[PDB]
Amino acid sequence: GRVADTVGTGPTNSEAIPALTAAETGHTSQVVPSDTMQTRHVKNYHSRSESTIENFLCRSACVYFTEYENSGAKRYAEWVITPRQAAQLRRKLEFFTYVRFDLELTFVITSTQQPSTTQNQDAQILTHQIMYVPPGGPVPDKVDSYVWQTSTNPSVFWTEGNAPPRMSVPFLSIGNAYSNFYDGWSEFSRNGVYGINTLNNMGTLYARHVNAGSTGPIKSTIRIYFKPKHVKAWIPRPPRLCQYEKAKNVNFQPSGVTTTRQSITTMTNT
Amino acid sequence: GLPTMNTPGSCQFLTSDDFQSPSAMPQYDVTPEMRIPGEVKNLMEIAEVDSVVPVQNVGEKVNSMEAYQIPVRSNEGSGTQVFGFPLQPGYSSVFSRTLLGEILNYYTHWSGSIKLTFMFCGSAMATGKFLLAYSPPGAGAPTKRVDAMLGTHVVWDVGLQSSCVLCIPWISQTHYRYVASDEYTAGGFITCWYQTNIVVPADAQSSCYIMCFVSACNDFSVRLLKDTPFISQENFFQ
Amino acid sequence: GLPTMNTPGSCQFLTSDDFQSPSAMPQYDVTPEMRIPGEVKNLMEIAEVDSVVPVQNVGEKVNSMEAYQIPVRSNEGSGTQVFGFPLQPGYSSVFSRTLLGEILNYYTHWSGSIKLTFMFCGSAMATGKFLLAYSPPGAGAPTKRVDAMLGTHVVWDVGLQSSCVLCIPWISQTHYRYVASDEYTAGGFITCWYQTNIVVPADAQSSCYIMCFVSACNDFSVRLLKDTPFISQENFFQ
Amino acid sequence: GAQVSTQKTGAIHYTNINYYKDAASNSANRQDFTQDPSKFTEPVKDIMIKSLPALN
Amino acid sequence: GAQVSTQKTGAIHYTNINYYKDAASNSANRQDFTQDPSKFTEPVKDIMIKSLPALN
Amino acid sequence: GYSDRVRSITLGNSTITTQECANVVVGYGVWPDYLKDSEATAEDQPTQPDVATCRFYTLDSVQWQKTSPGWWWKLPDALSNLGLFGQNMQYHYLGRTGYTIHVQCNASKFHQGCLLVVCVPEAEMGCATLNNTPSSAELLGGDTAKEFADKPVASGSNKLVQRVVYNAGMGVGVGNLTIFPHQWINLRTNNSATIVMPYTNSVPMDNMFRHNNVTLMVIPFVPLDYCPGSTTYVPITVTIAPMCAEYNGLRLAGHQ
Amino acid sequence: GYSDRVRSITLGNSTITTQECANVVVGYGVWPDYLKDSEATAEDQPTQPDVATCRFYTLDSVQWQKTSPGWWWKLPDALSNLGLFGQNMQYHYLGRTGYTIHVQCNASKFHQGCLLVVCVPEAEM
């Protein structure tokens, strides 16, 4: 892959008019800078590589995180899988109407002590469990519930001090691609939930401590990272303008087109 | 046991790295591909598509349609300046929110040739000419048409055909340029000057409008992906 | 010492992974194979076997044999509805505990063609006809036979041969469908309407019964293994 | 003494080697697709034809 | 069953091998450069020539 | 002899002739067509009404005024009350279609103006308040054009859609909409515009009432400006032709 | 093996199976078909809905009593309220069709009776 060459040109007097066209045809003129002026023969070795889709969408990104503790009310963290709860990733996928790719998950887990008066706290190495539950499956309501046996559901056992865990997932959609934007209802009566929320059922993701690990309370932090691969795309569109509001719908707060400046002639931003 | 020595960089998580990982759901079955119109293989094919330019940012008009319109009015004397804006496609407020503006902000470096397409939306009978000038840096934006001449200019004429194409060539002492504002590599300037005052018949409207377009030529290229400062966040969306 | 760098994902235990491990009892001797009738190489060969359908779930009859029986009685007028049930083979209570129902619950996605086999167990002399209709979604279950006509229906007749086969074709806008309940992909409906009232001689019993069957055609397939919500537990068994 | 096979795709080769002396140490075989429904469906002595009545 | 390809340079070969049985385990493909702008620019039925007027 | 200003389109019975126009923008470059048997899903044999369906329709013409913000239609449900394509929509669970949109607004040489005809696949509009969602009655109307509103919509408890033009209802820059196929109606050199849309969707076929996959938008950039004494009332008219329709899964009559 | 008592008819979606019947009387001996271009008149291109139209319909079943004289239907207008064939009837000035009539009345071996199914072109009352 390489940039095209700019071919040289001498003077010109002739009835052929490159510099004119009609944009009303919805046709972007192909005119190259050699047409409207004199140009020297130049070889360009610049490459378009880093502009390909693959390098554009493929970077790890932090979609979300939770907090679960070693004791008390919340002993585990549950999250439904949507990319849209993190701003900067969701925008990178809103260029393309229909996207296709294979997720690569990576988790980053950290632990934190909590203030308490407990005496003779002595740590031990904690062990985190991460369980995936495809839709409709059983839902644990308590940490010791039988569902954690994971007779089937893919699950990962992890330990502090080791490398962050990683697993790859193939393309899970029913149709021929994921859909970022969907106009329609879920019900033939045009009622109920509107928007893309209906298409998205990915199941649920859970995590827990395996063992108490110490006498004193401990709070943990988990982080998910997507890294799309093998990407294909279709039907690009305008980037989003107004700040996001909700994760279930495109709702926005009306905001201006751009920033402003002084009188048209003024050559500097304000 | 084949002897081996770990090297610095083991057990680290790099954001951009390339590695193989074991699949979490073996022998999963993938639904077949479909043929969908409009398949993008590269972002450069977006960068060649025309887009409107909010050339008029003045005041509070940015909340209306008038941000996209350029007033053109019959004067009593010739040589007045129609408009002008600096060329900093990733920084300057003009191109900031444009189509080309968005794609750049993800990238630090770029080079190529930016086309500017103009289209005269005025009344069918009224005619006119215009001088589209490009002044490379080294001096302030020219304040008199006579000064704009010494740049690279295309005298453009209204008539049966409508659209015009001003192709800004690539002139710089480096190969690439920062997309972020810096005084070292600063791009240049652009102006539009009345060549000949707008002539209008009777009963035809005096004032017209001119819309601008932006696109990247086939020599365009970018580099060094990064974050875009525009989109904000506070706490996770719900 | 060949230089090497660990990558993220070392020293983790994945549930579904594929790896080699050292044997704990070297050179153990394995008893030879035997040829056992009925060797399964694939679960799909279970999914093609017939099974009875508890079509009648009404009330407390689920604790008796009558859950498998469909009452059919001579009426004074024609067009009454024999029965009906939604098609959601992994969710709907009908197919839930069936043979096909169990195998699905382990899998999230499926597609294929479900056959319904009906068999008339009534008296040998009594005869009758029936209209087996399938109405794809987009409207409620048809409440009048005239409405059931516009679906895909097989007019079926009692006689010397007994069994019938209603083959539900595969009609959906996607390739697969969720096995769990969702309004997006919802399957359809099925009804059975008297075509012609049951005619019985004298001294022969008035009321009959009709049992239903379920099987998967040879185009059936599934995907994405998971847990089944049915089986419970409290503490380890002893 | 390596070996080569094909991955699972939809619309490639991988190199595997057995490192141990015991059969039970080899990786699982996920790829055996052989299927013959005749051992559950159609378990009859007289072969029946679809296009004909069952009991003649 | 290895494979050989070329790195990304400006003014060499690397040996890659796929170790897993699932396509989604293979490394990303960074090198596909194929580009055809005609699907966005020039979306017209009548092919237009640069050297000629647009509306004749 | 020939001209590039003139075009004649013929589908089924209807025909549309225009003596001033530009070329015909075709989709992304894929001319619409039937369904190849490689991608098929439904195993029933599809109906192909052909001439009964493929032909041109004309919706209600809408006035165009100096302050008029713009308009949008939803194609999958617009025609639903017109012709057999409205009937063959209600009796099937699936449909596959592609659209030829033809917009007609003419004016004398003394009328300034510019329009923007874009055809936006899967335009998803937000809501007035942030929590709710638009009602099915507000996003749609039978054969009738819904119009934007030039200034922000006050946010109550209602379900109203957000009609501001500069965000185009999708919360994007209106100036950027040209990535989608489009053409410019310009009262100077043009009269009518034309678009051809192939079938775009995630899955090979779709239900028509649920999912409206193609949205049509006409946004004036340069308002109508004319000296007094010239005729005031200039309508805009839209023409919409399905192409290569197919249908599957015949069922009873209705949507519910 | 075979039997002449049994028949299976399939058109479009619907299917009708009967285990006791006789052969199928076909017209005067002309199997129905489309229109050859020798006899055509209308110069517009004809619509051929095919599966949307061709299929079986079931009208209202009518009781049969000891004194019941008989019944008559008019085919061109019966279906007019049913299915697309009812819709495609209202939107066109012309139509060309042929009919497959299937009448179903069953009884046990102890019921005497005889019926007459005739199909009368242009019955003028």
Ligand SMILES: CCCCCCCCCCCCCCCC(=O)O
């Ligand atoms: C331990 C196993 C974890 C498995 C992680 C599964 C995560 C599924 C990711 C789905 C991806 C992005 C899809 C958006 C869905 C939609 O809106 O249609």
